[PDB]
DNA sequence: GTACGCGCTGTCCCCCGCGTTTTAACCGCCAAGGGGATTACTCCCTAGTCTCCAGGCACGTGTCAGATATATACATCCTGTGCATGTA
């Protein structure tokens, strides 16, 4: 979440994005929530609800 | 008068540039603690101010020091002044 590259690529002008990854981490919901927010900026920060 | 500033010369030589090697620094982790100037508050105590009585460095006066003009007892030529022996 706090990485500079995370905010670096958010402003890029694209209308469709695709993610390629083998396996994300199961627990530690923070990284999954961060990936979800990066995919589209609509979800709320509160993932503990 | 003269010799050093100036102009010219060759001699070579050390940094420039372009390339190649090596490395300092920021990003991620993983969020953790850690301390020092700041703001507010609470006492607290020593200089400002007044105060008069003592007194002391700027000031004027005396006297030795340093330097200078003045007779003074010789000092060095200068002026008369006298003597002895050979000459026509």
Curated annotation (Swiss-Prot):
It is found in: Nucleus. It comes from the Eukaryota. Belongs to the SNF2/RAD54 helicase family. SWR1 subfamily. Component of the SWR1 chromatin-remodeling complex composed of at least ACT1, ARP4, RVB1, RVB2, ARP6, YAF9, VPS71, VPS72, SWC3, SWC4, SWC5, SWC7 and SWR1, and perhaps BDF1. Present with 656 molecules/cell in log phase SD medium. Catalytic component of the SWR1 complex which mediates the ATP-dependent exchange of histone H2A for the H2A variant HZT1 leading to transcriptional regulation of selected genes by chromatin remodeling. This is Helicase SWR1. It comes from Saccharomyces cerevisiae (strain ATCC 204508 / S288c).
């Amino acid at each position: 979440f706090r990485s500079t590259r995370w905010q670096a690529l958010l402003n890029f002008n694209t209308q469709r994005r695709l993610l390629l990854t083998g396996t994300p981490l199961q627990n530690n919901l923070a990284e999954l929530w961060s990936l979800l927010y990066f995919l589209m900026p609509q979800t709320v920060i509160d993932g503990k609800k």
